[PDB]
Design a protein around this ligand. Sequence first.
Ligand SMILES: [K+]
Ligand SMILES: [K+]
Ligand SMILES: [K+]
Ligand SMILES: [K+]
Ligand SMILES: [Mg+2]
Ligand SMILES: [Mg+2]
Ligand SMILES: [Mg+2]
Ligand SMILES: [Mg+2]
Ligand SMILES: [Mg+2]
Ligand SMILES: [Mg+2]
Ligand SMILES: [Mg+2]
Ligand SMILES: [Mg+2]
Ligand SMILES: [Mg+2]
Ligand SMILES: [Mg+2]
Ligand SMILES: [Mg+2]
Ligand SMILES: [Mg+2]
Ligand SMILES: [Mg+2]
Ligand SMILES: [Mg+2]
Ligand SMILES: [Mg+2]
Ligand SMILES: [Mg+2]
Ligand SMILES: [Mg+2]
Ligand SMILES: [Mg+2]
Ligand SMILES: [Mg+2]
Ligand SMILES: [Mg+2]
Ligand code: NA
Ligand code: NA
Lengths: 117, 94, 194, 126, 42
Amino acid sequence: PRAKTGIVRRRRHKKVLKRAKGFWGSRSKQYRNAFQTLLNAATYEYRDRRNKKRDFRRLWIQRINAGARLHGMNYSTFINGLKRANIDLNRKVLADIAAREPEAFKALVDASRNARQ
Amino acid sequence: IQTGGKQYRVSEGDVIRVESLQGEAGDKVELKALFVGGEQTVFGEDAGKYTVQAEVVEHGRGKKIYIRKYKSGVQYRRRTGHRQNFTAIKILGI
Amino acid sequence: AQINVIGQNGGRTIELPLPEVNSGVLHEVVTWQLASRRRGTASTRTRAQVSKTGRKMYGQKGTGNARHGDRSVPTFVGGGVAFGPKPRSYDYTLPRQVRQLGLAMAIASRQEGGKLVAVDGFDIADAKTKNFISWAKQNGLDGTEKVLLVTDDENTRRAARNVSWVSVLPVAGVNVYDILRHDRLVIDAAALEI
Amino acid sequence: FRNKKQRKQQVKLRKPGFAVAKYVRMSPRKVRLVVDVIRGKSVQDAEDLLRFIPRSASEPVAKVLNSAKANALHNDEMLEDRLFVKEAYVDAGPTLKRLIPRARGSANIIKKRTSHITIIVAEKGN
Amino acid sequence: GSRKDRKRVGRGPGGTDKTAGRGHKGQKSRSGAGKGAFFEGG
RNA sequence: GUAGGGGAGCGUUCAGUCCGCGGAGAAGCCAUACCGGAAGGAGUGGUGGAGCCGACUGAAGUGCGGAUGCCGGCAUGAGU
RNA sequence: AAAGGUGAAAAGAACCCCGGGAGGGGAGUGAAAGAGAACCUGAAACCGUGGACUUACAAGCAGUCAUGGCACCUUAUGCGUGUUAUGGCGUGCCUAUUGAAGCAUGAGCCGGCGACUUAGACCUGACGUGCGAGCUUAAGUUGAAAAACGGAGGCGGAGC
Ligand SMILES: [K+]
Ligand SMILES: [K+]
Ligand SMILES: [K+]
Ligand SMILES: [K+]
Ligand SMILES: [Mg+2]
Ligand SMILES: [Mg+2]
Ligand SMILES: [Mg+2]
Ligand SMILES: [Mg+2]
Ligand SMILES: [Mg+2]
Ligand SMILES: [Mg+2]
Ligand SMILES: [Mg+2]
Ligand SMILES: [Mg+2]
Ligand SMILES: [Mg+2]
Ligand SMILES: [Mg+2]
Ligand SMILES: [Mg+2]
Ligand SMILES: [Mg+2]
Ligand SMILES: [Mg+2]
Ligand SMILES: [Mg+2]
Ligand SMILES: [Mg+2]
Ligand SMILES: [Mg+2]
Ligand SMILES: [Mg+2]
Ligand SMILES: [Mg+2]
Ligand SMILES: [Mg+2]
Ligand SMILES: [Mg+2]
Ligand code: NA
Ligand code: NA
């Protein structure tokens, strides 16, 4: 008994191709180039899952030291002034606090200075 | 966050890690670290005076994400399905 | 332990194969049986010698963008097949003891539900067929389930022609596949039986 | 409604203001060049431009324009003083492959394109 | 019956196919091909 | 984690068997934001105008991006 | 070499409109013309028309992640779908190699075809089953909508 490859290769291929959306060129229309894009695509996806965390952390920091600086301190001094006191252990989300509620974050700064010198 | 959503929140149902106890309306007590309840800023430790009460809404199953790996020139292509489970909790505390 | 419907009455003869019927054991059997049925059929020009084509073509080096010799090879639309179907047999000889054991275990499988025997079919009376069905309707044989008759006597077969009711089996040519194929079984004669 | 069968016998499906010249022994591209000038404009104007455009696709494009108008006027009973080229376009037809002998023994293949010039007219509607 | 009839649970195992494995290049790397005359005697 | 060894499965055609579906409409094709740990599977709609899923089991001409591969169609060079 | 297919049956389009024609639009036949005779299905490359969101100081393996704008809500008004601006990041695939994005090999694109098979009571091992100190037949004969008969022979059984 024979067994053509009928319908199989079409579906596989279509699954691949349907992945290609904002895909410029023949990346989105010719199978091979599509699949091939999908390799390096893998690479980027997987690494970016890990990377996005680095990114965000950086973001939050970049805000936090700004807040710090708005009063007369910095990020080093500020976080450190929450380490000396087991009191404040926010760390995460702090950026949102310096971005939305200024007064609160002022209070935190004042606390940091008070738990240092 | 890591677990247990503190902070000041006005009755909102959020989604975090699972909470073991399956069911519904299971009282969930959480410690605070900051909040603006009545425009009164309160730091950590002292916040222990106030605690958040939350009820479980539903045990939803995460969003479907395909995990793909690839190393060029060596073959190695990996494809496996994944969804991390959770639960929704309705914040309603002090 | 099955009692004869028409005529005598025994059923306590014939020992039953242990354990209480084993699937895999019938598996080995049926498989072997259908295997001896498969016929040798393989219309394929696997050989590159079998199809129509020359032996030389284009030059090895030179022409460029080629490198081929004949036009009958598997890589060619129209050539031969690489590793295609050859006419073969696939008929072995499943160990006798195991074939003997087979149908024993088959009947065994039928002795725990739809089992039926009968001596002498004076009720048949020529072909007719109609009175044969009428007969079945007096033996739990509605005609809802498939049945296999394994009895000698021409006149009885002659009066047995249908698809869902029963089935004719000349000269006790028993076969695990057959019995296990139909639901009820009608051994009738006590030739091979007891 | 019903299902997919009934709708078929209850409606025949008409094409208001539609003409097609199929198989025109010209390459689509040129004819595109000619058509482009009529894209969405008065049918009168249309007839007038085709009469002066120095290209030869002009002819068949013209003939089809007219056939459309003819249809809208006789088969669709439209008001010709409000007619205009709603839409028009040229698709490639089957191709005429011809074997043209080149130098040193090699041959090529001339590709003689054809065309399905279609054009569809319509009342302006303000 | 004929449909609830299973196997011996460990009788016949799937055959080894060499086409497709997202990293299969059957045989050695070099010097092993369309050549079955190496032998182990001599 | 490469060569390599071991294990569990998906998918396709044919075959037996069983449960069946089909003019109020099969397969095939087309779309899709759903499901599964992967191979994949399903719902709905569109097209179609006759046949075909699922389960279990057996057998293979059984899974393609490559081979200056084979056949065929259509592009680029250009309105040159 | 290649080349199959109207429909149940020709009733396979009388007549009218544009055109030299080809071609087409009506009308009618038929269940269907979304079957019209270079007529079953009608995938992909490839060409084109319409629409949405976009683009004319930036260096682009053509993605990926994050955010914003705009648009649409048939698995689907809040989970997302489409598109896009900007930021971060980012050296095609295969092969062959000590070492490849390589300025090393292959390849225009898509479709279809295309490669670890089969045979020999052969040899050796794993697994499974039937028998068990014994275990099995081969040719063939007789029967075939089924299979039984056939112990010439081979392996155990003592080694050196
Ligand atoms: K393997
Ligand atoms: K005509
Ligand atoms: K490869
Ligand atoms: K053994
Ligand atoms: Mg980290
Ligand atoms: Mg070349
Ligand atoms: Mg042939
Ligand atoms: Mg009618
Ligand atoms: Mg090699
Ligand atoms: Mg070497
Ligand atoms: Mg050779
Ligand atoms: Mg030798
Ligand atoms: Mg029909
Ligand atoms: Mg093959
Ligand atoms: Mg290729
Ligand atoms: Mg080259
Ligand atoms: Mg070619
Ligand atoms: Mg020019
Ligand atoms: Mg030039
Ligand atoms: Mg020039
Ligand atoms: Mg790389
Ligand atoms: Mg280069
Ligand atoms: Mg190169
Ligand atoms: Mg070289
Ligand atoms: Na699907
Ligand atoms: Na456009």
